[PDB]
Write a protein that binds this ligand. Structure first.
Ligand SMILES: [Cu+]
Ligand SMILES: [Cu+]
Ligand SMILES: [Cu+]
Ligand SMILES: [Cu+]
Ligand SMILES: [Cu+]
Ligand SMILES: [Cu+]
Ligand SMILES: [Cu+]
Ligand SMILES: [Cu+]
Ligand SMILES: [Cu+]
Ligand SMILES: [Cu+]
Ligand SMILES: [Cu+]
Ligand SMILES: [Cu+]
Ligand SMILES: [Cu+]
Ligand SMILES: [Cu+]
Ligand SMILES: [Cu+]
Ligand SMILES: [Cu+]
Ligand SMILES: [Cu+]
Ligand SMILES: [Cu+]
Ligand SMILES: [Cu+]
Ligand SMILES: [Cu+]
Ligand SMILES: [Cu+]
Ligand SMILES: [Cu+]
Ligand SMILES: [Cu+]
Ligand SMILES: [Cu+]
Ligand SMILES: [Cu+]
Ligand SMILES: [Cu+]
Ligand SMILES: [Cu+]
Ligand SMILES: [Cu+]
Ligand SMILES: [Cu+]
Ligand SMILES: [Cu+]
Ligand SMILES: [Cu+]
Ligand SMILES: [Cu+]
Ligand SMILES: [Cu+]
Ligand SMILES: [Cu+]
Ligand SMILES: [Cu+]
Ligand SMILES: [Cu+]
Ligand SMILES: [Cu+]
Ligand SMILES: [Cu+]
Ligand SMILES: [Cu+]
Ligand SMILES: [Cu+]
Ligand SMILES: [Cu+]
Ligand SMILES: [Cu+]
Ligand SMILES: [Cu+]
Ligand SMILES: [Cu+]
Ligand SMILES: [Cu+]
Ligand SMILES: [Cu+]
Ligand SMILES: [Cu+]
Ligand SMILES: [Cu+]
Ligand SMILES: [Cu+]
Ligand SMILES: [Cu+]
Ligand SMILES: [Cu+]
Ligand SMILES: [Cu+]
Ligand SMILES: [Cu+]
Ligand SMILES: [Cu+]
Ligand SMILES: [Cu+]
Ligand SMILES: [Cu+]
Ligand SMILES: [Cu+]
Ligand SMILES: [Cu+]
Ligand SMILES: [Cu+]
Ligand SMILES: [Cu+]
Ligand SMILES: [Cu+]
Ligand SMILES: [Cu+]
Ligand SMILES: [Cu+]
Ligand SMILES: [Cu+]
Ligand SMILES: [Cu+]
Ligand SMILES: [Cu+]
Ligand SMILES: [Cu+]
Ligand SMILES: [Cu+]
Ligand code: NA
Ligand code: NA
Ligand code: NA
Ligand code: NA
Lengths: 126, 126, 126, 126
C-alpha cells in the first residue's frame, strides 16, 4: 500500500491511522472474497448470514478506508464515528466467520482479518 | 426507485425503511454532484471543506443505502448503527452546504437533500 | 432524485445523461436487494450465479452513476467507456435474473430494471 | 493483503489475478488520498481536473478490485471488460497526475501507482 507515503506528502500533514487505512482495504477485499467463497460452497444454505455480514463488512470497510484516507488534517470529520461503526461491523463479521472457521478455511482467514481490522480501527479512534 | 417493490417480494419480508433507502441513494448522488459542482466554481478554494464533506457523505450514504437494502428480515444487522452514522454525516454535510447556499444554488439544493436524508435515517433507527 | 436540479446548477453546465444517472442508482439498489432476496430463498443454491451477477451489477451501477454525476462539463472523462461497461453488466445481469423471473418475482422486477438501465446507459453513450 | 490466501481456499479454485486485485485496492486508496491532497493545496484551482480523475479512478479501482475478488472460478463474468475499463481509467489518471508530479510529490507517487495498476489490470485481461 501507499498509505504512509501519501500521508507524509499531504499539504495539511500517524501510525494508528496508517494501520487503520491499510487494514480497512485488506479487510474489505478479504470479506468480498469470503462472501464469494461461501456462495460457492456446497453448503451455501448454512452460510446465508455469513455471506450477508461479509457484504456489509466489505462495504463499510471501503467506506471507512476512504474516509480515513481523507483524514490527514485537523478539520472536523466523521472519521471517528465512522471508525467506531467499522469496528463494530468487523466485530460482528468476525464472530460469524469464526463460527464457520473449523469447516471453511476461507472463514478462518477472514475471521482473523476482521479481528485485526477491528482492533486497528478501534485503536485509531484514540 | 424500486425499493418498495423489492422489499415486498423478499422471502423474509416498512415505510420508514423504504424512505431511508430511497433518500440514501438520492442523497449520495446529490452530494457527489455537489462535490463536483464546488470543484468547478471559480471560488473552489473557499469550498475545500464542503467538497470533502460531500465526498464523505456520498460514500456513507451509498454504504447505508446498500446495507439497508439488505435489512428486510429480523436477523442481526449493523443497520441501526450504520443509519446513526449516516444521520450524523448528513447533519455535518448539511451544515456546511447550508453555509454556502446563499452563494451557490447547488449547495442550497444539496443542503435540503442532506437535511431530509438525515431525518429519514434517524427515523428508520426507531 | 435531484439529478436534473443539480446538473442545471453546475458551473460548467442533457436528458439522456439525467436518465442514465437516475437509472444507475435505481438499478444499483434493485440489484443489491435482488442479491439479498436470492440469498434468502429456500432454493439459494440455484441462484449462486444470479447473486454474484447482482453484486457486480450493483457495484458497477454505483460507480457509473457516480462518474456520470461528475460528467456535467466538456472535459475528458472515462464516462463513455464506463457507461459501455455498465450497459454490458446490466445486459448480463438482466439475462440471468430473467431466467429466474418465472420463479421469483423479485427477479422479474430486477430483470426489468436492469433492461431499462442497460438501455439508458447505452443511450447516454450517443 | 490476503488476496492470494483467499483465492487458494475458494471452493471453485493465478498470479496475474492476485497482482491485479492487490493493485486495484492500493491504487484506489492512493487516488483517494491524492484527490484529498490536491484539494488541500494552495494551488487547488490548478488541480481541478486531477482531483476529478482521481475520484473516478478510486471509484473504478474499488469496483474492479471487488469484481476481481469474485472472479476465482470459470463462470461468465464482466471481469475482463471491467479490467479493461480500469486500465483505461488508470492510464488517464496517470497522465494527469504525472503532469503535476514535478510540483507535487503526492502526484508523483500517485502517478507511479496508477501506471503500475494499469499494467497489472491489462496483464490480467490476458
Ligand atoms: Cu475493516
Ligand atoms: Cu473484512
Ligand atoms: Cu465466507
Ligand atoms: Cu461465510
Ligand atoms: Cu467479513
Ligand atoms: Cu469490514
Ligand atoms: Cu471494520
Ligand atoms: Cu475499519
Ligand atoms: Cu465475517
Ligand atoms: Cu464465512
Ligand atoms: Cu468462509
Ligand atoms: Cu467468512
Ligand atoms: Cu473477515
Ligand atoms: Cu469474513
Ligand atoms: Cu473488517
Ligand atoms: Cu470484516
Ligand atoms: Cu479496521
Ligand atoms: Cu443519506
Ligand atoms: Cu447527500
Ligand atoms: Cu457543492
Ligand atoms: Cu460545496
Ligand atoms: Cu453532502
Ligand atoms: Cu450522505
Ligand atoms: Cu446520511
Ligand atoms: Cu443515511
Ligand atoms: Cu454538504
Ligand atoms: Cu457546498
Ligand atoms: Cu454547492
Ligand atoms: Cu453543497
Ligand atoms: Cu447535501
Ligand atoms: Cu452538499
Ligand atoms: Cu445525506
Ligand atoms: Cu449529505
Ligand atoms: Cu438518510
Ligand atoms: Cu445500471
Ligand atoms: Cu441493477
Ligand atoms: Cu435476486
Ligand atoms: Cu437472483
Ligand atoms: Cu442485477
Ligand atoms: Cu448494474
Ligand atoms: Cu449498468
Ligand atoms: Cu449503467
Ligand atoms: Cu440480474
Ligand atoms: Cu435472480
Ligand atoms: Cu430474484
Ligand atoms: Cu434477480
Ligand atoms: Cu436487475
Ligand atoms: Cu437482478
Ligand atoms: Cu443495471
Ligand atoms: Cu443490473
Ligand atoms: Cu444504466
Ligand atoms: Cu487500479
Ligand atoms: Cu489509483
Ligand atoms: Cu492529487
Ligand atoms: Cu492532483
Ligand atoms: Cu488516480
Ligand atoms: Cu483507479
Ligand atoms: Cu484501473
Ligand atoms: Cu484496475
Ligand atoms: Cu491521477
Ligand atoms: Cu495530482
Ligand atoms: Cu498530487
Ligand atoms: Cu495525483
Ligand atoms: Cu494515481
Ligand atoms: Cu493520482
Ligand atoms: Cu489505478
Ligand atoms: Cu489511478
Ligand atoms: Cu489495475
Ligand atoms: Na479531511
Ligand atoms: Na439482512
Ligand atoms: Na467531470
Ligand atoms: Na465469480
Amino acid at each position: 500500500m501507499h498509505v504512509e507515503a501519501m500521508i507524509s506528502k499531504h499539504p495539511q500533514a500517524d501510525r494508528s491511522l496508517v494501520q487503520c487505512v491499510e487494514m480497512c482495504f485488506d479487510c474489505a477485499q478479504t470479506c468480498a472474497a469470503c462472501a464469494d467463497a461461501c456462495l460457492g460452497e456446497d453448503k451455501v444454505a448454512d452460510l446465508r448470514h455469513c455471506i450477508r455480514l461479509n457484504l456489509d463488512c466489505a462495504e463499510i470497510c471501503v467506506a471507512a478506508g476512504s474516509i480515513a484516507s481523507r483524514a490527514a488534517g485537523t478539520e472536523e470529520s466523521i472519521l471517528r464515528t465512522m471508525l467506531q461503526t467499522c469496528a463494530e461491523m468487523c466485530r460482528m463479521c468476525e464472530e460469524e466467520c469464526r463460527r464457520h472457521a473449523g469447516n471453511h478455511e476461507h472463514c478462518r482467514i477472514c475471521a482473523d482479518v476482521c479481528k485485526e481490522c477491528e482492533t486497528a480501527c478501534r485503536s485509531a479512534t484514540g
